[PDB]
Structures are given as structure tokens and as C-alpha cells.
Structure 1
Amino acid sequence: NDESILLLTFLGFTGLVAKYLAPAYKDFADARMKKVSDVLNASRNKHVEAVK
């Protein structure tokens, strides 16, 4: 029907994204999270050393 094939394909596209794009976006988020975490931790422990 007019609005049926796209409806059935929506879950297929979503599963296709979940196959790669879900873990890919997870890895991209985690990498930046750890990078900013280290960037703030180094500044913190370096300000601690400056106070020292």
C-alpha cells in the first residue's frame, strides 16, 4: 500500500543503523568522554601540584 513498504523498511533501516552506527556512535562518544576526562584530570592534578 501507499504507506506500507516504507513502514516495513523503517525497522530494517533502524536495524541496519544499530548494526554499525549504534556501536560507532557509542565509541565516538566514549573516546571524547575519556579525552575530556583526562584533559580535566591533568589540569586538576597540575593545579594541585602548583598549589604544592
Structure 2
Amino acid sequence: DESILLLTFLGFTGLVAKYLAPAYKDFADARMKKVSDVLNASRNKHVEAVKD
């Protein structure tokens, strides 16, 4: 009975890995980029201040 349930869970992880796992990778990547760009922007900014 419960081997049917375990089969359902295997299917569940299959769908998750199919659709969600690349999506969550892309989502996480997008944010990571944004944080990095802001960080690097701040570095540029203080370099400007020295020159000023």
C-alpha cells in the first residue's frame, strides 16, 4: 500500500527537480548578481571619493 505512496513521493521529487530546481537556481542567481553589483558599486564609489 505504502509502496504506492513512496512511488508518489518519487514522482513528486521528479517534478520538483524538473521544473522547480532550475527555476530556483535562476532565481537565486538573479539575486546574487544584484547583491554583487551593489557591492562592487560601493567599491567604485569610495575610489571616487579619494580622487575627489
> Matched residues in 2 for 1:48 and 1:16: separation?
48
Give the aligned CA root-mean-square deviation in angstroms. Answer: 0.9
> Matched residues in 1 for 2:29 and 2:8: separation?
30
Name stretches of at least 5 consecutive residues in structure 2 with no aligned partner.
none
Cα deviation 1:21-46 (Å, max 9, x = unaligned):
00000001000000000010001111
In the alignment of these two chains, the number of paired residues is: 51
> Matched residues in 2 for 1:51 and 1:6: separation?
65
Q: TM-score, normalised by structure 1?
A: 0.88
> Matched residues in 1 for 2:8 and 2:50: separation?
60
Q: TM-score, normalised by structure 2?
A: 0.88
After superposing on structure 2, the runs of 4+ consecutive aligned residues of structure 1 that deviate more than 6 Å are none
> Matched residues in 2 for 1:15 and 1:47: separation?
48
Identity of aligned residues (%): 100
